Amino acid sequence: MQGSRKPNIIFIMADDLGWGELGSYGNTFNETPNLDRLSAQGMRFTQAYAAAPVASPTRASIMTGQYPARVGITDFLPEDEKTDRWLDPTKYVTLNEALSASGYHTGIVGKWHLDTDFKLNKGGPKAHGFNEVIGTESEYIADGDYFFPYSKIASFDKGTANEYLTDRQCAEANAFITRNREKPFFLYLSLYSVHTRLEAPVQLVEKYKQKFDQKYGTGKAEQFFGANNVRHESAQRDNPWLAAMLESIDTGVGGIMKTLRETGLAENTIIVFFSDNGGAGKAGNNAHLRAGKTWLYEGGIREPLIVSWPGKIKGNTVNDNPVTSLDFYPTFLAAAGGKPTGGRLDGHNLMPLLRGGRASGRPLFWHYPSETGKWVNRMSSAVREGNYKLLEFYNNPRLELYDLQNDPSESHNLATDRPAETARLKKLLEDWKKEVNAEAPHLAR
Amino acid sequence: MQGSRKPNIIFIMADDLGWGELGSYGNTFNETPNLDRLSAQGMRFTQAYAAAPVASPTRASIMTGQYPARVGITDFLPEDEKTDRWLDPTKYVTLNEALSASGYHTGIVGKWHLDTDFKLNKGGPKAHGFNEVIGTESEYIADGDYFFPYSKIASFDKGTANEYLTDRQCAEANAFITRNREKPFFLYLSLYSVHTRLEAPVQLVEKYKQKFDQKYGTGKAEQFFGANNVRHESAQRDNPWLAAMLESIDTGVGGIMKTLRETGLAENTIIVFFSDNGGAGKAGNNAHLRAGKTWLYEGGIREPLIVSWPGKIKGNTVNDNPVTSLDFYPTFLAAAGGKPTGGRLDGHNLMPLLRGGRASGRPLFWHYPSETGKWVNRMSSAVREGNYKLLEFYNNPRLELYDLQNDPSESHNLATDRPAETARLKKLLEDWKKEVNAEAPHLAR
Numbered sequence: 001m002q003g004s005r006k007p008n009i010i011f012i013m014a015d016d017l018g019w020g021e022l023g024s025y026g027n028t029f030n031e032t033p034n035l036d037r038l039s040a041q042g043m044r045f046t047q048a049y050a051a052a053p054v055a056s057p058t059r060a061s062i063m064t065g066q067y068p069a070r071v072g073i074t075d076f077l078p079e080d081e082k083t084d085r086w087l088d089p090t091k092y093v094t095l096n097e098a099l100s101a102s103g104y105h106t107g108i109v110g111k112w113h114l115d116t117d118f119k120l121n122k123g124g125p126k127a128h129g130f131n132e133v134i135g136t137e138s139e140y141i142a143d144g145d146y147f148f149p150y151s152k153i154a155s156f157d158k159g160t161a162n163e164y165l166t167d168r169q170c171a172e173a174n175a176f177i178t179r180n181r182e183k184p185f186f187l188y189l190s191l192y193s194v195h196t197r198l199e200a201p202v203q204l205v206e207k208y209k210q211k212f213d214q215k216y217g218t219g220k221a222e223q224f225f226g227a228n229n230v231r232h233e234s235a236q237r238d239n240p241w242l243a244a245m246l247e248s249i250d251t252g253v254g255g256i257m258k259t260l261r262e263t264g265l266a267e268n269t270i271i272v273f274f275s276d277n278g279g280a281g282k283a284g285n286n287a288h289l290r291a292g293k294t295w296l297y298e299g300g301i302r303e304p305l306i307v308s309w310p311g312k313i314k315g316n317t318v319n320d321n322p323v324t325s326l327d328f329y330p331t332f333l334a335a336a337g338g339k340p341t342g343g344r345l346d347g348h349n350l351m352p353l354l355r356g357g358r359a360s361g362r363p364l365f366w367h368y369p370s371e372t373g374k375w376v377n378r379m380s381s382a383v384r385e386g387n388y389k390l391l392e393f394y395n396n397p398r399l400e401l402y403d404l405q406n407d408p409s410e411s412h413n414l415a416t417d418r419p420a421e422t423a424r425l426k427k428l429l430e431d432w433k434k435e436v437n438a439e440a441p442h443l444a445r
Numbered sequence: 446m447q448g449s450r451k452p453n454i455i456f457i458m459a460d461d462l463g464w465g466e467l468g469s470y471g472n473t474f475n476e477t478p479n480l481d482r483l484s485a486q487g488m489r490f491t492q493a494y495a496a497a498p499v500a501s502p503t504r505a506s507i508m509t510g511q512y513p514a515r516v517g518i519t520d521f522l523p524e525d526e527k528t529d530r531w532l533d534p535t536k537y538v539t540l541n542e543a544l545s546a547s548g549y550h551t552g553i554v555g556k557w558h559l560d561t562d563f564k565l566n567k568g569g570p571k572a573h574g575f576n577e578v579i580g581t582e583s584e585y586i587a588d589g590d591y592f593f594p595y596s597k598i599a600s601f602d603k604g605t606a607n608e609y610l611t612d613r614q615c616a617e618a619n620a621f622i623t624r625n626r627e628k629p630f631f632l633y634l635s636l637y638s639v640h641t642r643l644e645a646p647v648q649l650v651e652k653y654k655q656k657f658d659q660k661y662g663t664g665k666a667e668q669f670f671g672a673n674n675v676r677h678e679s680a681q682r683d684n685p686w687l688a689a690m691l692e693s694i695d696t697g698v699g700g701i702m703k704t705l706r707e708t709g710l711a712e713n714t715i716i717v718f719f720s721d722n723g724g725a726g727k728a729g730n731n732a733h734l735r736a737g738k739t740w741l742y743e744g745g746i747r748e749p750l751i752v753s754w755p756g757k758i759k760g761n762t763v764n765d766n767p768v769t770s771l772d773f774y775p776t777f778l779a780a781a782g783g784k785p786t787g788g789r790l791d792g793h794n795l796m797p798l799l800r801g802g803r804a805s806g807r808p809l810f811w812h813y814p815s816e817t818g819k820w821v822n823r824m825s826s827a828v829r830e831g832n833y834k835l836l837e838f839y840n841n842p843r844l845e846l847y848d849l850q851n852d853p854s855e856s857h858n859l860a861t862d863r864p865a866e867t868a869r870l871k872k873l874l875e876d877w878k879k880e881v882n883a884e885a886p887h888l889a890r
């Protein structure tokens with residue numbers, strides 16, 4: 001049946017995928033032709049942020065549209081026994097629910113990480129009200145399992161011999177699209193890749209091993225990523241394993257793009273590609289940005305963001321205006337013709353910015369007391385307003401001020417030479433910490 | 446719900462798989478641990494026959510329980526334009542239908558080859574009345590396509606990146622078993638493997654390449670099965686490609702065995718493993734038997750046959766009594782508590798033989814006029830009674846008589862030295878040819 005429908009929203013989020021990994025973000029070693037095509041057909045954001053440097057909190061910010069620091073989940077959820085924290089369906093109108101109330105059929109394929117209690121799972125995707133829950137974790141994901149049978153995903157009872165998890169998740173996204181082709185749907189495709197431990201089909205690893213050898217010289221893939229290197233992690237840039245895993249994600253995104261064309265849904269479907277936090281040390285490529293996962297330096301919070309909506313969003317555009325994972329909830333609600341019912345949101349509707357509208361300045365905030373990692377040197381809070389970013393560290397207490405425009409690698413601390421800017425950003429950060437009841441860092445007394 | 450049900454019947458048939466390929470049949474190069482376990486848990490037949498040396502006719506004999514020569518399909522069905530032959534659902538009560546009438550839910554996963562007209566497909570598995578038709582050919586299978594997307598199987602619209610066809614078919618068998626666990630079912634698992642062109646996942650090919658090298662010396666896999674060898678076919682015994690394809694079949698049979706245990710169906714399920722014709726020249730291993738596919742010599746018609754029915758059939762038994770693919774229809778009907786309604790059958794109920802009963806002698810017959818292959822030297826008819834087998838050839842007209850007990854490789858023709866036995870078998874063969882209206886071979890006038 002033809003006629004106006006509210007547009008499908010497909011949200012594709014990689015796990016721990018760095019800002020410097022995609023071909024569109026300047027990477028020449030990895031191959032992401034499908035994502036680069038999605039980029040040439042959409043708007044690419046160079047200053048997109050996860051609202052936290054770790055899994056659970058960014059996922060919290062997406063499903064609640066609220067500051068992780070306000071929710072009280074600022075660090076990844078560990079195994080059940082190491083935490084009393086979970087996302088409570090009675091405490092938030094989640095994004096899937098707001099879309100349900102706007103006439104959408106809702107689906108999650110894969111990683112939740114908003115409840116690590118599997119005995120009762122009161123805060124699982126089903127309990128939050130997803131119409132379809134497909135291949136979500138059935139136990140603490142931990143170091144992972146990427147090959148059928150998937151030891152972390154009991155609900156994937158059926159599969160083929162040595163089936164790769166990324167390939168499975170992307171096939172389930174295709175079938176979900178086809179089953180639900182006739183009505184508005186929200187599909188949250190929550191990839192386990194590229195979370196350590198790094199695993200990819202041998203032929204893809206062999207391919208990037210040889211490409212590593214061609215780039216660096218004969219034997220270099222064995223020298224740096226041989227049987228010796230058990231987790232395939234190194235200080236060498238260009239990781240054949242992450243490249244092979246990113247090729248499986250990329251080929252998967254191409255299957256979804258193909259399925260949308262075939263089913264006639266491309267013209268009325270919003271496609272977002274995002275990552276929940278910065279690249280992981282010894283695995284990920286955050287380009288020239290400082291540090292990565294678990295740090296509030298740019299490398300831990302800067303993410304690839306591609307938004308495609310054919311004939312609504314101009315193709316092959318680059319947007320430098322800062323945005324965060326808080327912005328998705330109000331953006332999807334505007335596209336769905338919905339209004340937040342009582343629900344308060346800490347993000348802003350991006351649809352006017354996506355349609356070529358002029359940008360508007362707003363302070364952006366982060367808080368990482370590392371309640372789970374206990375990373376004393378990484379414990380910190382941050383405000384960005386304009387090009388200035390202020391980081392407050394709690395162990396070795398200090399302020400760091402960077403001009404991200406002139407110093408995007410955060411290599412020159414300005415706090416001392418620019419005290420009035422420092423004092424002005426400190427006041428915004430302190431006010432925000434009281435507004436959200438920011439959790440004190442876990443340090444000695 | 447517990448209580449007596451008629452037993453599930455799972456019929457697993459490989460394409461063009463030779464008598465000498467399985468570990469249980471003496472092969473040390475290939476690895477078939479799951480099938481060898483099925484063998485240690487069932488009855489293994491050393492003198493089992495396909496009723497024809499080619500695909501379509503053997504499949505005809507299975508679904509009709511009638512001599513291929515009586516049906517009028519004695520050679521494989523070519524593409525639509527090269528044939529007016531098809532199996533007509535209005536001319537036979539097919540096996541799936543006889544089981545339906547005995548209270549079974551019926552399923553085919555894969556190859557039919559009983560209709561090559563895809564414009565109308567009047568003689569397809571659905572038209573013959575299978576409740577579930579899964580991954581059947583949507584066009585002439587020809588040289589094949591073993592990797593998703595499967596160019597010969599349009600109904601496999603959904604799949605993962607570079608999914609292997611054998612792995613897919615065996616996963617679909619598992620899900621079929623699970624969906625239908627509560628009621629009696631017949632599953633015809635009709636594998637496309639190991640039909641040329643030989644294709645298998647690289648890691649399995651690499652594995653048997655190295656094993657070939659270990660057996661024959663360094664470089665020998667490249668020497669005989671390198672980039673040079675496009676179809677991976679050779680005169681060398683031990684083919685890394687067929688071994689890798691047979692390992693995928695074997696691992697698949699293990700998944701089915703596992704699924705039956707998990708679902709509690711192993712105690713009330715009959716498992717048959719069979720092959721539709723002898724191993725293919727330049728690909729298959731027919732051990733010491735003469736020739737292979739398209740010949741009525743033992744290599745073209747002798748098949749692996751393992752029947753498992755825990756606590757009804759004695760485990761780890763070897764049965765030397767001759768049986769054929771004609772025997773399946775009446776055997777499955779007896780196990781289903783059914784009686785052929787009007788339908789005439791050319792085979793015999795094996796259930797008394799499977800339960801440890803004494804064997805009974807019966808003449809067995811073949812006719813190959815090669816209406817499709819046009820193989821003038823291979824065109825022939827054959828009778829086996831006891832250990833004596835008489836072959837009649839039409840091009841270079843002659844009788845060949847072999848004592849298969851003392852001469853299983855058919856290397857010593859006895860027709861001249863044993864004229865009275867020859868004349869006696871000639872009379873049975875001629876009578877049978879008139880009984881079934883045997884099609885004259887396609888030769889010059």
Ligand SMILES: [Br-]
Pocket residue numbers: 001002
């Ligand atoms: Br219409």
Ligand SMILES: [Br-]
Pocket residue numbers: 054055056076
């Ligand atoms: Br994590």
Ligand SMILES: [Br-]
Pocket residue numbers: 375377378
């Ligand atoms: Br540290």
Ligand SMILES: [Br-]
Pocket residue numbers: 417418419420421422
């Ligand atoms: Br200043």
Ligand SMILES: [Br-]
Pocket residue numbers: 426427430
């Ligand atoms: Br202050």
Ligand SMILES: [Br-]
Pocket residue numbers: 446447
């Ligand atoms: Br019961």
Ligand SMILES: [Br-]
Pocket residue numbers: 499500501521
């Ligand atoms: Br054939």
Ligand SMILES: [Br-]
Pocket residue numbers: 820822823
């Ligand atoms: Br010949």
Ligand SMILES: [Br-]
Pocket residue numbers: 862863864865866867
């Ligand atoms: Br004689």
Ligand SMILES: [Br-]
Pocket residue numbers: 871872875
């Ligand atoms: Br005669």
Ligand SMILES: [Ca+2]
Pocket residue numbers: 015016054055276277
């Ligand atoms: Ca993550």
Ligand SMILES: [Ca+2]
Pocket residue numbers: 460461499500721722
């Ligand atoms: Ca065959």
Ligand code: NA
Pocket residue numbers: 079080081083084085116117
């Ligand atoms: Na807990």
Ligand code: NA
Pocket residue numbers: 088089090091092093094097128
């Ligand atoms: Na809720």
Ligand code: NA
Pocket residue numbers: 145146147148149150151
């Ligand atoms: Na696994």
Ligand code: NA
Pocket residue numbers: 524525526528529530561562
């Ligand atoms: Na035809």
